[PDB]
């Protein structure tokens, strides 16, 4: 089954367990192997795996990680993925004293939006976009990964799991505990990631749910009805919220030109309905001079 794979090193862990880098002994291909324990007497195959496998089998795009194979035993599932050098979080950390070049930032953002637009077009919400789930190679490519918490949606959306997306990257609709959320939550996360690529620090590092909201409000201005109709009628909205003014993006992301500021702000609109789509973002003036540079590794 796994006879043609030779393990090289643990490349990390995750929901199912250990993720190993391995080599096909016959073809030379380097892969990531996700081993998933099957609960053969108790709960069977995890929903997390059923969703990841089924959704990745549909999503074939250059900016979405490729699932190559699914190897069955009675006791285990092995997921064979393309191998990618590292994730965006490790890259950012490694770039702490060199900074990251702007053309590369723009390239990565452009590619992330292409991958995301592909999910949305194919009725899939990612719901866990953060640097640790974005994989880069040595050639300038970036790809959405870890579809563990993804979900095929219908139109219009219905109520899905509320406990979704890591806190820092979580859209205010989820925080305020709204009945319905959509593609817009994914755009929020990317917005937080754009910010973070520019500064190499998280934009909203909350300690808690209330703290997360306050951090958003401190920066983007406390929302009201004019900015976001129906915000004050939201379940977790509180009329006692301090009323903070918006901070100029010239202080939020100083390195960023006027185009980046514009695109960043549309990506972080409060109202999910007015927040820009991945399709739309792809046309923004920020991307007119986009290129595909290689990272320094």
């Amino acid at each position: 089954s796994m006879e043609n794979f030779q393990k090289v090193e643990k490349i990390g862990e995750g929901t199912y367990g250990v993720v190993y880098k391995a080599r096909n002994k016959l073809t030379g291909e380097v892969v990531a192997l996700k081993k998933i324990r099957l609960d053969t007497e108790t709960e069977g195959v995890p929903s997390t795996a059923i969703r990841e496998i089924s959704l990745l089998k549909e999503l074939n795009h250059p900016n979405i990680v490729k699932l190559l194979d699914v190897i069955h035993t009675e006791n285990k599932l092995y997921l064979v993925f393309e191998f990618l050098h590292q994730d965006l979080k490790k890259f950012m950390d490694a770039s702490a004293l060199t900074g990251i070049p702007l053309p590369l930032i723009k390239s990565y953002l452009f590619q992330l939006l292409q991958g995301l637009a592909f999910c949305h077009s194919h009725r899939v919400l990612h719901r866990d976009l953060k640097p640790q789930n974005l994989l880069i190679n040595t050639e300038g490519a970036i790809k959405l990964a870890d579809f563990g918490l993804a979900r095929a949606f219908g139109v219009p959306v219905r109520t899905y799991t509320h406990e979704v997306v890591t806190l820092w990257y979580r859209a205010p609709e989820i925080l305020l505990g709204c009945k319905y959320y959509s593609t817009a939550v994914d755009i929020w996360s990317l917005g937080c990631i754009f910010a973070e690529m520019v500064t190499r620090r998280a934009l909203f590092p909350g300690d808690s749910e209330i703290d997360q909201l306050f951090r958003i409000f401190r920066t983007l201005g406390t929302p009201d009805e004019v900015v976001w109709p129906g915000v004050t009628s939201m379940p977790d909205y509180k009329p006692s919220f301090p009323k903070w003014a918006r901070q100029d993006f010239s202080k939020v992301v100083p390195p960023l030109d006027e185009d980046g500021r514009s695109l960043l702000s549309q990506m972080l609109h409060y109202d999910p309905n007015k927040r820009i789509s991945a399709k739309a973002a792809l046309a923004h003036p920020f991307f007119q001079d986009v290129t595909k540079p290689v990272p320094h590794l």
Binding site: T40, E43, H72, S121, H122, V155, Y180, S182, S277
Partner: protein, 261 residues
């Protein structure tokens, strides 16, 4: 608003139409099953409807489950004694795919009256996954209906309920409904729900969306009209009972129209 994914509705629709063809069960697989029949399958689906109501599952989950069953039975011969094991395994998978809070595996072994052990249920789970190759995100009648509803002006909840009701009735009878794609059955169920309640027909705007005209929907509407008229007398009654309740506006109690232009 973004809940109706305006920047994506068209792409999504175009993809679900291509996908409903690849997830399509073999028409008349039943003749090729030596030991099982449309009647047996009717009993199975009807039971899944009940299971659905007792575990307060989503309608979408029930629709996925039937897709899984029909594709499984397009590939594997199954003895009558194992038919229910297939059905239980498929509802477990549907639930795991679709539900925020799927019932636990134990609950699925209880609804079979301990006909099967937990190990059979989990092993059948694995087998079903292998046979379908993990292709589980199937377009359903419901995924087309919720989309077709957006063309209403205004929304009528009784139209929506009624089209849901007719949609499920089709799940029961492989003859004739296996010959129709979900998006077709959906369209026929919506025109017919609309006709019954408002007097209106299939809208131009949906003709433009789907490419289907009343001409092209005629075969399916003839069948569906007849199913609706005969529902009171059908051997399987679970869906009628389900749709008498307040929640679905009591639509199963409505008098079907005797004819349609």
């Amino acid at each position: 608003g973004v809940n109706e994914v305006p920047d994506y509705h068209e792409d999504i629709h175009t993809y679900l139409r291509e996908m409903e063809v690849k997830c399509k069960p073999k028409v008349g697989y039943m003749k090729k099953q030596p030991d099982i029949t449309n009647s047996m399958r009717a009993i199975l689906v009807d039971w899944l409807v009940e299971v659905g109501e007792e575990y307060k599952l989503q309608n979408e989950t029930l629709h996925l489950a039937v897709n899984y069953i029909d594709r499984f039975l397009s590939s594997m011969s199954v003895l009558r004694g194992k038919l229910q094991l297939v059905g239980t395994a498929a509802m477990l998978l549907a639930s795991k795919f679709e539900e925020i809070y799927p019932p636990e595996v134990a609950e699925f072994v209880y609804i079979t009256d301990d006909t099967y052990t937990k190990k059979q249920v989990l092993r059948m789970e694995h087998l079903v996954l292998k046979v379908l190759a993990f292709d589980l995100a199937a377009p359903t009648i419901n995924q087309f209906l919720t989309q077709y509803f957006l063309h209403q002006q205004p929304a009528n909840c009784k139209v929506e309920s009624l089209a849901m009701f007719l949609g499920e009735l089709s799940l029961i009878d492989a003859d004739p409904y296996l010959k129709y794609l979900p998006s077709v059955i959906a369209a026929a169920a919506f025109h017919l729900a609309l006709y019954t309640v408002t007097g209106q027909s299939w809208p131009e705007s949906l003709v433009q969306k789907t490419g289907y005209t009343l001409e092209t929907l005629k075969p399916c509407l003839l069948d569906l009209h007849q199913t609706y008229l005969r529902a009171p007398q059908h051997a399987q009654q679970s869906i009628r009972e389900k749709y008498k309740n307040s929640k679905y506006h009591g639509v199963s109690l409505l008098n079907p129209p005797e004819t349609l232009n």
